[PDB]
Design a protein around this ligand. Structure first.
Ligand SMILES: OC[C@H]1O[C@H](OC[C@H]2O[C@H](O)[C@H](O)[C@@H](O)[C@@H]2O)[C@H](O)[C@@H](O)[C@@H]1O
Ligand SMILES: OC[C@H]1O[C@H](OC[C@H]2O[C@H](O)[C@H](O)[C@@H](O)[C@@H]2O)[C@H](O)[C@@H](O)[C@@H]1O
Ligand SMILES: [Ca+2]
Lengths: 1276, 148, 80
């Protein structure tokens, strides 16, 4: 078309769109801009909803977007179609602007009148337009043409007051069935009139309702005698003949004793916890070697269970067809309807063929693969029976199973009546279990049961191990973590917070002083908006996040190119009564809203909740954008998709390109990060956190390349050390959502200096002078097109403690970037007036302190570093070593019981979240994150970082995947997905190095020590919620559940046996260090082990140590794609097969060389059924080979309706999920997806699975609507 | 690699493997959705990923549409994103305009330096003459933009 | 007319519209007139032109059945 361009903004002049190039020139002519083909006339305006001529092409452009697309133009006298590229179309349909459709022929001229195209009959008016959705008299016949295709079809219309029928050829219908567009069938008699009621035609009987609709899959007593109307044609059957095609037959024959199991135990059967699986192999008594001679079987000989046994005929038939297709015999189309004897014979010819290819290949691995493949074919043995879903946290991995306490079937998996789910802080006592306030306990992988006292003790052991990691693993008391981040707070039992808090109190006396508390900085990933108040009621043992400020950054600065919330919203004026800033009366009662810490006039007089805050995180505004970028460039299709590191690297190049785009527009990345950091880093009453990926690029190697934002943020950080202290004020040139004439919505944030708490305070109460050269002024806008009125002035009230003082810029935005001034001499100055205000105008002339005059406009700007305004000002004359921080006090400041306190000392800290989930793997040992951190500790000391949040150091579970969806944490090795919780990079046992993504354990201890040498703390990521890729299998009892552990509403997956991967190796570091430190700890601090936890009423339990994980300590798992009935079960009795103990064996009778009879058999009392394994069906539903369903009562007899009696029966089965009301016909067949009449004439409806439906509306494929009352009946 | 419609008119698409496609798919450059049984959704909304998408009656192709959330009409584009500050259509053929807060606009509206007339129902009127500014104004047959 | 005659080898093939200026169309008619007289001399006949005009005329809606409201209902079925 025309070669594509990017990096140019769109501008609107006088109602018209212009496009200005990266070059800076206005664009004319046809242009492909970013994949969109557009045109601009001679004046540079864009064309929409009109045709233009370029080269040989006649191109229309859209009326909304202005994008090139197909249309019809009247050219001279005549209609002619055109495509998106401007070519006259031939032999094609085109729809015009009005949505009208023409078909243009070989010559490009539109067809008129009746026409057949792709074998479809269609009509066109005299102007060439296609008739759709209407009748039409053409060729002495009337024809209806369909709504969208416009194809001829049968339809009905009402002539006079009588419905009439019209066929596809336009002839009226007489003596026949004919449809209407909606989908309803009618019958019309010799006189053309529609028929009603019960009608016999061509020796068959049909039921037409009052409306004349033919009813299919409809049961009722029509001749005062039962009659079921066919699902195919609506033809009435008496439903007296049994439809099952399988009589009772014996299966035993000359091969039975050969194929029977050698033994009824674990020797001869591959199993899990005694149970069998679809891909179990077993040891037959004898082997048909080579297909010739039966020979006794050696222990090594093992054969697939599916060679000899099947759960049902459907599966048997499928096995036969599948194996046939692979060259093992006559390729066959077998069904469940095929006779049992035939299938069994065919299984033997396949068995023969199998033994021949075993001799030929001298291997069975080919067969292993064949069985594996086949098994996953079957819905009962794959995810189709697992109800994969993606809403809520299920988005991550496809859905969850909750494990159940079931001592009878699965006792190793019993949790001892633990597994309290969703005990998040707001629901720690279970009191919100029935609402959405129940915690989303399930997040990823195998969710650990942290409601179990034994597990709680283990988590404390782990915690201790981390806090003493260096002492324990290197006898280095300087290589120990100082504090923690609690991952996924709302997805675990909130007791863990108390356990961790109390541990720190006991060992470090954090409740004694601010100095103790602050030596072990600790944070929470606590997303719920009610968590801050909880955390505070519990004494702030770890710092809550402050999402309210992170959120407002999103709305007002960080997110979106244009429509952004005003900066006004940062104030939260509602904090005060009637939004009054003159009167400032605090509103003691509010509707649970507002920002955590008010900063309109924060003098430190009101107590506020201590907190950390951030602009971005490893897991906030990173993972989504980075993937959107890969998706957008075709590198992956879905967010959940698996990607390789090279795929990530390619995506990262687009991400970086977008981030640094000089246009200033950002598609994936965040806007105004500098401006956001300026606010974050000047705010009172918070510990700010800085994201590695805003300082360095999120991909590639650790600290490989700084970001464009690095200079500005680094300046802000160093200035925070020098100038940030004392009280705060914050104001905006704005009163709400909407702006008056002069109003700019520019935010002004001020800090005063050390002892200065207010605007009008002129001096410290202790008469210290530190304040005079401290304080800072920040101005920020969110409007890049901001232009001030000439009169307008914008003021920073630096305070009456700073009268007549000279101030100089730290940071100033402009149209190409943001200038950064490193010292007083290189920057513009400006002096405050008598009242202490720095006044700014549209136009400013600043003077350098010595050098020269500078010109500067208060102007919104647009470039890679900003979309809006940013100005930061500091007092000149600041000392080189000036430090405005407050040291933490050793005195017992407070008797409130609390650990952390928001004050000037706490505010003097800065956390650095020093990693990105999307870092590349180290190309060399020297560039490993923790090696680099050691060489660079210096650099962070000088940015004022007091605590370094390191990535989780645990060994990645990597590419390992036992079933179900892998997560990016795992395949990107970021440390959040791990197999061994105590392996932080130890060498292989053979001696070889084995680093994590971040380096060896020595590298970690060196990195931690380096940080202590530079006065910084090291934070351990405590990840108690889950663990990945456990190599041992167990059989659990599982229910399908949503993130909160609530059973999905319409699932049959309830209390079913499942093979899960829940058991640890037992030889891993978890085995070495598991529970080891608890005995020492109980001796030294008894009360930790005697104090009760809230959720359990119990204290933690160190009487049992966890060296090996297993299912009994888990709440559940993400679905593993194995199937609801991968654990094999007999349909007839519903018992699962087992061989664990010889006293309680259950196997199919074939395998024990007994006679297995299978099929339906009538007796005087009724019909009975025997399964393939030879057991009688009792209290179970059974499906025959033709697809009909039946219910067998407790007595062993099929349920069936009698004459004159109600066919509807209430069923209560062993399998609870099937409980409900069913409609069984005289031949026992259950009615499904259709209406059934009872003996008294009432109509009910029965769903996909046979169940009665109550209390709802129901729609029909033909658009008929019916209503079912509560008692089930149909009002309609 | 072909569509087939069954006896009931249900539509499946079978890939190179022969297994029917399931979930979101692009075919001949058309975006389409398939339920877990492989059936093609036609004439309805659907939630795939994080974005709600309407799929057309016959083609099933993704297109803009409007639905009524609470008592207020809302607009949905072809990618399943709700529309803010823009014009968007519905299946019938009507164009609406939705403001920054997502709410449909009504009456005479000036946007991007041009004036459009939306009737009581929020329908953009094209090829419409009238004098409701106490001055004559003809609204374009192309885009509905007022000319004098 | 100009576009039709152009297509038959008589000049530069043209897309002219009613929107084209009158002067341009008249000039173009003359270059076609010239070309016409040349093929009249070359062929020594005007029958080729008779056929060209006949054809062209039926192209135009005012000079064909499109302005006659062809219909087929009732006895109109027979002949239009
Ligand atoms: O090949 C698809 C289709 O092409 C034409 O219809 C196009 C278009 O017409 C209207 O806009 C309908 O509302 C849409 O559903 C259609 O996609 C032909 O008319 C039709 O016969 C053909 O099936
Ligand atoms: O999220 C903290 C925020 O809470 C309130 O405002 C909520 C919300 O109000 C709007 O709809 C704006 O569009 C959003 O940006 C706001 O976050 C407080 O009123 C506000 O001051 C505070 O920042
Ligand atoms: Ca959990």
């Amino acid at each position: 078309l025309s070669d594509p361009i990017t990096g140019g903004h769109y501008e609107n002049h006088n109602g018209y769109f212009v496009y200005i190039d990266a070059s800076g020139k206005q664009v004319t002519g046809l242009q492909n801009i970013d994949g969109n083909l557009q045109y601009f006339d001679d004046n540079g305006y864009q064309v929409k909803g009109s045709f233009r001529d370029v080269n040989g092409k006649h191109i229309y452009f859209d009326s909304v977007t202005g994008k090139a697309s197909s249309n019809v133009d009247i050219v001279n006298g005549k209609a002619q179609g055109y495509d998106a590229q401007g070519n006259q179309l031939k032999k094609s349909y085109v729809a015009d602007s009005s949505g009208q459709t023409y078909y243009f022929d070989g010559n490009g001229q539109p067809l008129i009148g009746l026409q057949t195209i792709d074998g479809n009959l269609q009509y066109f008016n005299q102007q060439g337009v296609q008739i759709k959705g209407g009748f039409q008299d053409v060729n002495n016949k009337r024809i209806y043409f369909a709504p969208n295709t416009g194809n001829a079809v049968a339809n009905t219309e009402i002539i006079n007051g009588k419905l009439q029928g019209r066929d596809a050829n336009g002839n009226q219908v007489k003596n026949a069935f004919s449809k209407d567009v909606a989908g309803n069938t009618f019958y019309f008699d010799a006189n053309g009139v529609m028929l009603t009621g019960l009608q016999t035609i061509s020796g068959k009987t049909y039921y037409l309702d009052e409306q004349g609709h033919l009813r299919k899959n409809y049961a009722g007593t029509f001749n005062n005698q039962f009659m079921y109307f066919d699902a195919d044609t609506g033809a009435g059957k008496t439903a007296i003949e049994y439809q099952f095609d399988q009589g009772l037959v014996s299966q035993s024959n000359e091969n039975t004793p050969h194929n029977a199991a050698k033994s009824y135990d674990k020797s001869s059967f591959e199993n899990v916890d005694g149970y069998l699986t679809a891909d179990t192999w077993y040891r037959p008594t004898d082997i048909l070697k080579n297909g010739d001679t039966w020979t006794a079987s050696t222990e090594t000989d093992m054969r697939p269970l599916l060679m000899t046994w099947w759960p049902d005929k459907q599966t048997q038939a499928n096995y036969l067809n599948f194996m046939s297709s692979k060259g093992l015999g006559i390729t066959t189309t077998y069904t469940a309807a095929t006779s049992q004897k035939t299938l069994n014979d065919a299984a033997f010819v396949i068995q023969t063929a199998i033994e021949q290819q075993i001799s030929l290949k001298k291997s069975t691995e080919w067969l292993r693969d064949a069985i594996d493949s086949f098994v996953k074919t079957q819905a009962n043995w794959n995810k189709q029976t697992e109800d994969e879903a993606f809403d809520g946290l299920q988005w991550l991995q496809g859905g969850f199973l909750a494990y159940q306490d079931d001592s009878h079937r699965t006792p190793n998996t019993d949790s001892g009546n633990n597994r309290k789910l969703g005990r998040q802080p707001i629901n720690i006592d279970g009191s919100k279990d029935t609402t959405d306030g129940k915690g989303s306990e399930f997040l990823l992988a195998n969710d650990i049961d942290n409601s179990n006292p034994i597990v709680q003790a283990e988590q404390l052991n782990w915690l201790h191990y981390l806090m003493n990691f260096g002492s324990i693993t290197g006898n280095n008391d300087n290589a120990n973590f100082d504090g923690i981040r609690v991952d996924a707070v709302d997805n675990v039992d909130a007791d863990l917070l108390k356990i961790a808090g109390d541990y720190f109190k006991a060992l470090y006396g954090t409740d004694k002083s601010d100095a103790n508390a602050n030596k072990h900085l600790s944070i929470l990933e606590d997303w719920n908006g009610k968590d801050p108040q909880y955390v505070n009621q519990q004494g702030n043992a770890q710092l809550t996040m402050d999402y309210t400020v992170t959120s407002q950054f999103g709305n007002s600065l960080t997110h979106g190119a244009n429509n952004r919330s005003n900066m006004w919203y940062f104030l939260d004026t509602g904090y005060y009564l009637n939004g009054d800033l003159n009167k400032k009366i605090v509103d003691k009662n509010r509707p649970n809203s507002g920002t955590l810490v008010n900063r309109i006039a924060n003098s430190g007089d009101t107590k506020v909740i201590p907190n950390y805050s951030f602009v971005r995180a490893h897991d906030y505004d990173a993972q989504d954008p980075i993937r959107k970028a890969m998706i957008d460039h075709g590198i992956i299709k879905n967010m959940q998709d698996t990607f390789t590191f090279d795929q990530l690297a390619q995506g990262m190049e687009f991400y970086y390109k977008d981030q640094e785009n000089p246009s200033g527009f950002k598609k994936y990345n965040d806007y105004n990060l500098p401006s956001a950091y300026a606010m974050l880093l000047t705010n009172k009453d918070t510990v700010p956190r800085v994201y590695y990926g805003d300082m360095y690029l999120e991909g590639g190697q650790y600290m490989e390349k700084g970001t464009i934002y690095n200079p500005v943020i680094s300046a802000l950080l160093k200035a925070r050390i020098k100038y940030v202290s004392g009280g705060q004020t914050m104001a905006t040139d704005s009163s709400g959502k909407d702006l008056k004439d002069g109003e700019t919505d520019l935010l002004t944030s001020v800090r005063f200096g050390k002892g200065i708490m207010t605007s009008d305070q002129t001096t410290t109460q202790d008469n210290s002078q530190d304040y005079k050269n401290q304080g800072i002024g920040v101005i920020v806008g969110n409007n890049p097109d901001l232009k001030l009125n000439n009169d307008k002035t914008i003021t920073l009230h630096m305070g009456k403690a700073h009268k007549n003082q000279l101030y100089r810029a730290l940071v100033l935005s402009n149209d190409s970037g943001i200038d950064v001034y490193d010292s007083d001499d290189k920057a513009p100055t400006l002096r405050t007036n008598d009242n202490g205000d720095l006044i700014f105008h549209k136009t400013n002339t600043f003077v350098k302190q010595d050098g020269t005059i500078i010109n500067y406009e208060m102007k919104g700007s647009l470039n890679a570093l900003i979309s809006g305004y940013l100005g930061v000002w500091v007092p000149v004359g600041a000392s080189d070593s000036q430090d405005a921080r407050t040291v933490a006090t050793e005195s017992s400041s407070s008797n409130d019981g609390s650990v952390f306190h928001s004050n000037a000392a706490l505010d003097s800290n800065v956390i650095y979240e020093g990693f990105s989930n999307f870092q590349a793997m180290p190309t060399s040992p020297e560039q490993s994150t923790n090696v680099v951190i050691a060489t660079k500790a210096n650099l962070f000391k000088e940015l004022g970082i007091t605590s370094f949040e390191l990535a989780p150091q645990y060994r990645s579970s990597g590419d390992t995947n036992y079933g179900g969806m892998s997560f990016l944490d795992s395949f990107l090795n970021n440390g959040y997905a791990f197999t061994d919780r105590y392996d932080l990079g130890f060498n292989k046992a053979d001696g070889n190095p084995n680093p994590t993504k971040y380096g060896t354990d020595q590298d970690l201890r060196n990195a931690i020590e380096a940080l202590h040498k530079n006065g910084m703390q090291a934070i351990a990521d405590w990840v108690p919620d889950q663990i990945y890729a456990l190599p041992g299998k167990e059989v659990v009892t599982a229910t399908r559940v949503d993130e909160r552990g609530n059973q999905l509403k319409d699932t049959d997956f309830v209390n079913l046996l499942y093979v899960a991967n829940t058991k640890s190796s037992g030889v891993d570091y978890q085995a070495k260090y598991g529970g080891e430190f608890l005995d020492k700890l109980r001796e030294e601090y008894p009360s930790l082990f005697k104090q009760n936890q809230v959720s359990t009423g119990q204290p933690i339990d160190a009487s049992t140590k966890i060296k090996q994980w297993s299912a009994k300590y888990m709440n559940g798992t993400n679905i593993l794609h194995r199937g609801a009935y991968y654990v094999l079960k007999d349909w007839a009795t519903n018992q699962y097969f087992n061989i664990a103990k010889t006293n309680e064996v259950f196997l199919p009778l074939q395998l024990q060389n007994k006679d297995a009879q299978t099929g339906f058999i009538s007796d005087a009392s009724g019909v009975k059924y025997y399964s393939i394994s030879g057991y009688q069906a009792k209290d179970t539903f059974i499906e025959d080979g033709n697809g009909n369903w039946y219910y067998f009562d407790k007595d062993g007899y099929m349920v069936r309706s009698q004459q004159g009696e109600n066919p509807i029966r209430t069923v209560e089965t062993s399998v609870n999920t099937r409980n409900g009301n069913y409609y069984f016909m005289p031949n026992g067949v259950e009615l499904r997806k259709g209406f059934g009449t009872d003996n008294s004439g009432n109509v009910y409806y029965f769903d996909d699975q046979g169940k009665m439906v109550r209390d709802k509306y129901i729609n029909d494929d033909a658009n008929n609507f019916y209503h079912l009352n509560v008692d089930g009946t149909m009002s309609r």
